[PDB]
A and B are shown apart, each in its own frame.
With several copies, the nearest count.
Chain A
Amino acid sequence: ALVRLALEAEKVQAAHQWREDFASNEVVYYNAKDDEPGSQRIKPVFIDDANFRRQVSYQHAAVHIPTDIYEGSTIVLNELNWTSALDDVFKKNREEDPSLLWQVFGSATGLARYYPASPWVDNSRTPNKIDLYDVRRRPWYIQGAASPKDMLILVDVSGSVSGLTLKLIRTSVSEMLETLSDDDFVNVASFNSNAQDVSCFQHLVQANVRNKKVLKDAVNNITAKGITDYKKGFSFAFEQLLNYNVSRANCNKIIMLFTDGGEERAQEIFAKYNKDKKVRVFTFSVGQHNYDRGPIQWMACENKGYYYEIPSIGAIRINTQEYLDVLGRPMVLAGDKAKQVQWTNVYLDALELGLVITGTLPVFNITGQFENKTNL
């Protein structure tokens, strides 16, 4: 079922014409979590079913759009326009196996289109019932968006980071740790004229619930003081990634620096520990300040990494889950041999269904494949 869905989705997206005239012609779809120009809504019938412990309809597929994503933009409109072709294959899949549970396509733009149609979840409309669901952060999405990694979070705890930016750094580190799974290994270090571990681990750990809790509790107790020294910190980070005496993953050695700014590039350390660019370096500039952000971007660009800015709590959610786009380039380039179904851990369904396991298969973009034009 997953393979057929992925094939149909790729074929439909390949032959699609971009447009910006959604005012004249509207996209018709049923939206969940409800009850604007360019969109028409659908009123379902919502019969009651015995398999799903709620009311569902077998005539169209519901769409969930997160709160911060406005459903009137042209990207979302095009997404709905070209994803409206998955309903027929959804119906065929459910007709083949009537015992089929939820089928879902989670887009990279934020919206998740699932079948059968059913209203989103709510708990008595209490004030503490805001919908913060984001399909791009669900583990069944992250496990198929990339491969296991060997992340080592390097945190700036120098004196120039005390204040709002230190709190932002702590929150960002917690949200970054929230994206990891059991197959990934992580450790957290800090540096202020001296690099040291933030907890009792001293090396990479399997990053399960207990270890992640320990790391979060250790990172929520750090203080800012002393001068900054990027050379010692990066030496420590590269040394901890060359252990091989412990259990590891050996799949993605990445260094995720959290800082504000500086004037040090430290070319010698990078030319010493990775001449062959075997370790990616992602860089984050956190808070509102007036420090130079040049060397940070140079570090992000020289190594096959990326550079991000997190100026407020609002951007933490989105600007900490974007590194999976960079880590997915080799998988896309491999292409056909990377179309393998993966099954995830046991977790509680967000639509009140119990304990479930989710199959996973990514979908590639193949527009202009027979002409080899863009490839960007």
Chain B
Amino acid sequence: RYWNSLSNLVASLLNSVRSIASLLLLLFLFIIIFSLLGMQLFGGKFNFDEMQTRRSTFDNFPQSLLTVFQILTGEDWNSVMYDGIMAYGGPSFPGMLVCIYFIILFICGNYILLNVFLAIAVDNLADAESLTS
């Protein structure tokens, strides 16, 4: 920290965190709700194949949270969707609607994540305007 070209920026970051703790807790609550819904809806139905236990399941609560976080990050959600579809039998009229869940989990929550980035913009609006003093 021998330079002080980020002091106002660091203070703005701290104040922004203290202000958007509400957004962070709302995102955490959304993740908790969707994790509980996934655990209740799927649960221990991901053992149809007698080959190897899949790591991404909905058995426990921390495991459900990890799976929901992985889906929210967008990394390899198609495999989880395929497993969920195959849990309810296979590709058919009653056994395919469950994927709707995944779709919501990939859109609405992701939108929320994007809105978080928006707050950062306002934070930098508090820095550039403070540049001219």
A and B touch in the complex (CB under 8 A): yes
A164 near B60 (CB under 8 angstroms)?
A: no
- Residues on the A chain within 8 Å of B60, using CB: 290
User: C-beta contact mask, A306-345 vs B, less than 8 Å → 1, else 0?
Assistant: 0000000000000000000000000000000000000000
- Residues on the A chain within 8 Å of B52, using CB: 164
User: C-beta contact mask, B47-61 vs A, less than 8 Å → 1, else 0?
Assistant: 111111100000110
Cβ distance A262 to chain B, nearest Cβ, rounded Å: 16
Task: Assign chain A's interface to a size class.
Answer: under 10
DSSP class of A's interface residues: helix, strand, loop or mixed?
Answer: loop
Contact of A164 among B44, B47, B59 (CB under 8 A): B47
Whether A288 is near chain B, meaning CB under 8 Å from some CB there, is yes
B47 near A288 (CB under 8 angstroms)?
A: no
User: C-beta contact mask, B23-52 vs A, less than 8 Å → 1, else 0?
Assistant: 000000000000000000000100111111
Closest to A312 in B: B52
B50 near A167 (CB under 8 angstroms)?
A: yes
Cβ distance A291 to chain B, nearest Cβ, rounded Å: 11
Closest to B60 in A: A290
Task: Assign chain B's interface to a size class.
Answer: 10 to 19
- Residues on the A chain within 8 Å of B59, using CB: 290
**Number of A-B pairs, beta carbon distance below 8 Å:** 16
- Residues on the A chain within 8 Å of B49, using CB: 164
B50 near A288 (CB under 8 angstroms)?
A: no
Closest to B51 in A: A164
B window 40-87: CB within 8 A of A? 44, 47-53, 59-60
- Residues on the B chain within 8 Å of A290, using CB: 59-60
Whether A162 is near chain B, meaning CB under 8 Å from some CB there, is yes
- Residues on the B chain within 8 Å of A164, using CB: 47, 49-53
B47 near A162 (CB under 8 angstroms)?
A: yes
- Residues on the B chain within 8 Å of A288, using CB: 53
Whether A163 is near chain B, meaning CB under 8 Å from some CB there, is yes
Closest to A168 in B: B50
Closest to A160 in B: B44
User: C-beta contact mask, A272-295 vs B, less than 8 Å → 1, else 0?
Assistant: 000000000000000010100000
Cβ distance B56 to chain A, nearest Cβ, rounded Å: 15
- Residues on the A chain within 8 Å of B47, using CB: 162-164
Closest to A159 in B: B44
- Residues on the A chain within 8 Å of B53, using CB: 163-164, 288
Closest to A166 in B: B50
* Cross-chain pairs A/B with CB under 8 angstroms, 5 sampled: A160-B44, A163-B48, A163-B50, A164-B52, A167-B50
Query: Which A positions have Cβ atoms within 8 angstroms of B?
Result: 160, 162-164, 167, 288, 290
Known: A164-B49, A290-B59. 10 other contacts (CB 8 A): A162-B47, A163-B48, A163-B50, A164-B47, A164-B50, A164-B51, A164-B52, A167-B50, A288-B53, A290-B60
List of 6 A-B pairs having minimum Cβ-Cβ separation, nearest first: A163-B47, A167-B50, A164-B50, A288-B53, A164-B53, A163-B50
